């Protein structure tokens, strides 16, 4: 019943607003494949404008399952293989340590230890040529998993070049056309700026600023509504017209490598449900997250399975967000916040809301 969805989200979602000082909440919880929709606060303190369905949170990471799902819409057209090497579609990256490098590498983050960002200093696309150049690996292709932008980055800079569009151009109109979001963005239009929230780093507001592959990587804005139908998409994609998207999103969810009790999709990650709740909150932190942990490879990648815990994670300067689903389950929750808080506090608390509707 929807009073007690409500009940059960709100005794664990004011707590968390009051304590983390979040000005502004939007939650979506799917609940046997139906949403329901939640709003707290304000998106934007200086000119007075309440969150509401429509206002854009940046999403952080989580911006990099959408660039997951377009490389497999990719893969699904035949334009790409994840076997294909990186220099087949940057051949300009000359230099012994980038043969043997397949797009799947970058794509895993299991490339070599690619950094955790592009150097800020790293301003157009010769710098960033000059930048993967001089790259030297810490370790062999293939045998750690180091989180990374710039790994990713690049799989989706590199997923979309058959195409002959730009990755924002693609993304748009072989990804969110298709799936009807209408308020998902990597630039905000002046027209929709009324409704993008403002972030807050110790109360100063902020958005996040241009960067090299920052729409592969973190780039995405959207509302708590769009955010519902991507989840409700990627947790059942039985409705997709358009055959190379629904295979993609498939795709996003094969599991190609295992780290401890994690399987590494495209952008999404996995774990075989029923799990225990200690197996997420502990890998949402920041220790185990971005270290550097050997990957065990799963060839050829399992299928995707129904019995998941498919999640991803996402921050900003400004913007903390979530997303989770079971498909087994019929069952997922979308958590968009414009402040940031740890990523343990905001696992604990989706996995209280759901645990209660299992």
Do not use: C
Request: proline share 6%; net charge positive.
């Amino acid at each position: 019943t929807e009073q007690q969805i409500a009940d059960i989200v709100n005794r664990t979602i004011t707590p968390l607003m009051q304590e983390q000082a979040i000005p502004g909440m939007a939650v979506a919880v799917i609940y046997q494949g139906k949403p329901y929709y939640f709003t707290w606060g304000k998106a934007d303190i200086a000119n007075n404008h309440p969150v509401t369905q429509q206002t854009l949170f940046e999403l952080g990471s989580v911006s990099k399952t959408f660039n997951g799902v377009l490389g497999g819409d990719a893969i699904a057209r035949g334009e790409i293989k994840l076997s294909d090497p990186v220099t087949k579609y940057w051949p300009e990256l000359t230099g012994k340590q980038w043969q043997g490098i397949r797009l799947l590498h970058l794509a895993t983050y299991t490339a070599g230890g690619l950094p955790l960002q592009i150097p800020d200093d790293v301003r157009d696309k010769a710098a960033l040529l000059h930048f993967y150049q001089n790259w030297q690996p810490q370790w062999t292709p293939g045998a750690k998993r180091l989180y990374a932008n710039s790994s990713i980055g690049l799989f989706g800079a590199l997923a979309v070049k058959p195409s002959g569009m730009s990755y924002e151009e693609a993304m748009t109109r072989r990804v969110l056309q298709p799936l009807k979001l209408a308020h998902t963005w990597i630039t905000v239009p002046q027209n929709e700026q009324k409704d993008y929230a403002w972030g807050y780093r110790e109360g100063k507001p902020v958005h996040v600023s241009p960067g090299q592959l920052d729409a592969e990587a973190y780039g995405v804005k959207s509302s708590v509504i769009d955010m519902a139908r991507w989840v409700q998409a990627n947790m059942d994609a039985s409705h997709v017209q358009e055959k190379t998207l629904q295979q993609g999103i498939a795709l996003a969810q094969s599991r190609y490598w295992r780290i401890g009790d994690m399987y590494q999709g495209l952008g999404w990650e996995m774990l075989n449900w029923p799990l225990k709740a200690d197996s997420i909150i502990n890998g949402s932190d920041s220790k185990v997250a971005l270290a550097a942990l050997p990957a065990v490879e799963v060839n050829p990648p399992a299928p995707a399975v129904k019995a998941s815990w498919v999640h991803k994670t996402g921050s900003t300067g400004g913007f903390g967000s979530y997303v989770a689903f079971v498909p087994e389950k019929n069952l997922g929750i979308v958590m968009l916040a414009n402040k940031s808080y740890p990523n343990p506090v905001r696992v604990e608390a989706a996995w209280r809301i759901l645990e209660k509707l299992q």
